[PDB]
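Need tokens for this chain, all 75 residues.
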Amino acid sequence: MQIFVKTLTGSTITLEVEPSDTIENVKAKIQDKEGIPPDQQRLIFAGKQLEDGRTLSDYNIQSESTLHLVLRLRG
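Here are the structure tokens for all 75 residues:
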């Protein structure tokens, strides 16, 4: 599956994921691409922040769904 992550510049990155991936797994992928550590990332979808231990499926994140990356600079 492919999903989108909107970054701080308003740009968008695409990630290859599976529905069984955890939010922490997605943060690790974002760290691979952007260098931002997971503790400084918050991911927003459907008006809520997403919990690290839950899966994409849990949150009904589908093909071409867009997550918003939010920086929490105090980590």
